[PDB]
């Protein structure tokens, strides 16, 4: 039971876990009703029109960066019923991820991954970064600042463009300096991609109509792995890209793929990161954990009355698994660092979650999305916490027939094809 309350979107606000909140970094926004489904994790059942200036409207008319795959529907997720299903759909996916040993570990790491209190211009003091807070409206009408790790919110203009975003700092690269920052994941449980089971077909841009559907639990789990990296500040700079030499169509298109994506998928795709540069990243981020201990040791007092210095030093020693000594100074044990680092980068992978979900999934990040379907995972006759679409004791249990969009017709409505374009 990862979510204690079965939230209904129309549930009255209480100012604790059902409240209207504001995103401080946005700067200008009307309060939005949010739901805290777990310690440090909120769900905003709304379209994301706040987290960036250049996307205030849900209209397909931008010249920023087009993509072969896209779908738009400015009215999606606007009615209260759809927001209720969005909140119920995201909840069921969290529980599905939580019912697996791999997902339970990931979510534990996400809750522990508290963004670092490294925003003090006086190294003798520990102070929060305002990037990692939300403003909750209390019953008296006033605002209350609240730290959180992860925020799940509806997609922006392009409905199927699922990203993980975080607000930046003046100088610090929070997602790549070990500090970490509050992550916002644009996600929707009401859509899912289609893919081909054959590798020759799934990696060819002119073949396949998307026979099989992607289990949205893997999709969310994929995005959680990104947040896991960025909550611990070990995300690889997106400029570090890998040019695919093993695909004739990728090669003829010059399309790159970031190391962060190849790492997040894991399995056979992570090989494309040579051993040389893997130790390059491992050592680099390990040194960033030194500064955190160096900063953590110079801290003699704490700013604010939220928590005591000793409690914040303990939470950061639990997060980064610091090696605590009789003197009280914190250090980084390389043996313990490599375990946490390997846990976040090599254990939490899309490939590994496919093994625990017992589902069919595309075999490589270097494929061509075939189609996008419309789904509804809320009803138990459609989707379950423990089986997804492959419902047990039905004709959908074997051969991933639940994911077979041709055999499980009532659960998938093709909205748009991607092959040929
Ligand atoms: Cu991301
Ligand atoms: Cu990714």
Domains of the chain from N-terminus onward: 1-421 (3.90.1240.10)
CA–CA separation, 392 and 395 (whole Å): 8
Contacts 24+ apart (CB under 8 A), 30-38: 31/137, 33/9, 34/134, 35/7, 35/87, 36/148, 37/2, 37/3, 37/5, 37/7, 37/90, 37/91, 37/94, 38/2, 38/3, 38/4, 38/94, 38/107, 38/111
Indicate the helix (H) or strand (E) that contains 323: strand 323-324
| Cβ-proximal residues to 391 (8 Å cutoff; 6+ apart), any chain | 381, 384, 397, 402
Taking the CA atoms of 212, 217, 220 and 225 in sequence, report the sign of the dihedral they define: negative
CB 285 within 8 A of CB 277: no
DSSP 251-279: HHHT-EEEHHHHHHH-TTTGGGS-HHHHH
Max CA separation in the chain (angstroms) = 66
Q: How many CB atoms lie within 10 A of CB 253?
A: 12
Which ligand sits closest to the CA of 238?
A: 1
The three-state DSSP-derived secondary structure of the chain is: CCCCCCCCCCCCCCCCCEEEEECCCCCCCCCEEEEEEECCEEEECCCCCCCCCCCCCCCCCCCCCCCCCCCECCCCCCCHHHHHHHHHHHHHHHHHHHCCHHHHHHHHHHHHCCCCCECCCCCCEEECCHHHEEEEECCCCCEEEEECCEEEECCCCECCCCCEECCCCCCCCHHHCCCCCCEEEECCCCEEEEECCCHHHHCCCCCCCCCEECCHHHHHHHHHHHHHHHHCCCCCCCCCEEECCCCHHHHHHCCEEEHHHHHHHCCCCHHHCCHHHHHHHHHHHHHHHHHHHHHHHHCCEECCCCCCHHHHHHHHHHHCCCEECCCCCEECCHHHHHHHHHHHHHHCCHHHHHHHHCCCCCCCCCCCCCEEEECCCCCCCCCECCCECCCCCCCCCHHHCCCECCCCHHHCEEEEECCCC
Q: What does the block give as tokens for 252?
A: 């003829």
- CA of residue 174 relative to chain centroid, distance: 16
226 is in an annotated binding site: yes
| Cβ-proximal residues to 283 (8 Å cutoff; 6+ apart), any chain | none
Residue with tokens 């305002």: 130
Which ligand sits closest to the CA of 164?
A: 1
- CA of residue 95 relative to chain centroid, distance: 15
200 is in an annotated binding site: no
CB 185 within 8 A of CB 152: yes
54 carries an active-site annotation: no
Please give the distance, rounded to the nearest whole angstrom, from the Cα atom of residue 165 to the centre of ligand 1: 5
Q: How many CB atoms lie within 10 A of CB 342?
A: 12
Please give the distance, rounded to the nearest whole angstrom, from the Cα atom of residue 222 to the centre of ligand 2: 6
CB 132 within 8 A of CB 115: yes
CA–CA separation, 133 and 38 (whole Å): 16
Q: Is 23 helix (H, G, I), strand (E, B) or coil?
A: coil
CA–CA separation, 259 and 281 (whole Å): 11
Catalytic annotation, pick one of 196, 223, 260, 350: 223
Numbers of helices and strands, H then E, in the chain: 10, 18
Experimental technique: X-ray
Q: What does the block give as tokens for 327?
A: 């003197």
Please give the distance, rounded to the nearest whole angstrom, from the Cα atom of residue 226 to the centre of ligand 1: 5
Taking the CA atoms of 136, 138, 143 and 147 in sequence, report the sign of the dihedral they define: negative
Please give the distance, rounded to the nearest whole angstrom, from the Cα atom of residue 50 to the centre of ligand 2: 22
38 is in an annotated binding site: no
What does DSSP say about strands 133-137 and 125-126: parallel, antiparallel, or unpaired? unpaired
């Amino acid at each position: 039971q990862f979510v204690n309350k079965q939230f209904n979107y129309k549930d009255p606000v209480n100012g604790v876990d059902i409240a209207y909140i504001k995103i401080p970094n946005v700067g200008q926004m009307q309060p939005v009703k949010a739901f805290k489904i777990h310690n440090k994790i909120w769900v905003i059942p709304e379209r994301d029109t706040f987290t960036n200036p250049e996307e205030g409207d849900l209209n397909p008319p931008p010249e920023a960066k087009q993509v072969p795959v896209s779908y738009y529907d400015s009215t999606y997720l606007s009615t209260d019923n759809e927001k209720d299903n969005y909140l119920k759909g995201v909840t069921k996916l969290f529980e599905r991820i939580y019912s697996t040993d791999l997902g339970r570990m990931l979510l534990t790491s996400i809750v522990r991954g508290i963004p670092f209190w490294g925003g003090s211009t006086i190294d003798t003091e520990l102070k929060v970064i305002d990037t990692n807070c939300i403003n909750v409206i209390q019953p008296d009408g006033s605002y209350r600042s609240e730290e959180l790790n992860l925020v799940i919110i509806g997609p922006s203009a392009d409905i199927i463009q699922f990203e993980c975003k975080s607000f930046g700092h003046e100088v610090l690269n929070l997602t790549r300096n070990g500090y970490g920052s509050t992550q916002y994941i644009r996600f929707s449980p009401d859509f899912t991609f289609g893919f081909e089971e054959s590798l020759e077909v799934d990696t060819n841009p002119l073949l396949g109509a998307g026979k099989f559907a992607t289990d949205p639990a893997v999709t969310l789990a994929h995005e959680l792995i990104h947040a896991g990296h960025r909550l611990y500040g070990i995300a690889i700079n997106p400029n570090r890209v890998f040019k695919v030499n093993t695909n004739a169509y990728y090669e003829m298109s010059g399309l790159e793929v970031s190391f962060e994506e190849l790492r997040t998928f894991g399995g056979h795709d992570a090989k494309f990161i040579d051993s040389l540069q893997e130790n390059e990243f491992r050592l680099y981020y390990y040194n960033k954990f030194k500064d955190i201990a160096s900063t953590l040791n110079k801290a003699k007092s704490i700013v604010g009355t939220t928590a005591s210095l000793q409690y914040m030093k303990n939470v950061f020693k639990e997060k980064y698994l610091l090696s605590e000594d009789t003197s009280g100074k914190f250090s980084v044990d390389k043996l313990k660092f490599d375990k946490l680092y390997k846990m976040l980068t090599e254990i939490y992978t899309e490939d590994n979650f496919v093994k625990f979900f017992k589902v069919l999934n595309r075999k490589t990040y270097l494929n061509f999305d075939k189609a996008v379907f419309k789904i509804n995972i809320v009803p138990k006759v459609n989707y379950t916490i423990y089986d997804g679409f492959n419902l047990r004791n039905t004709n959908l249990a074997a051969n991933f027939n639940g994911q077979n969009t041709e055999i499980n017709n009532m659960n998938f409505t093709k909205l748009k094809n991607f092959t040929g374009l």
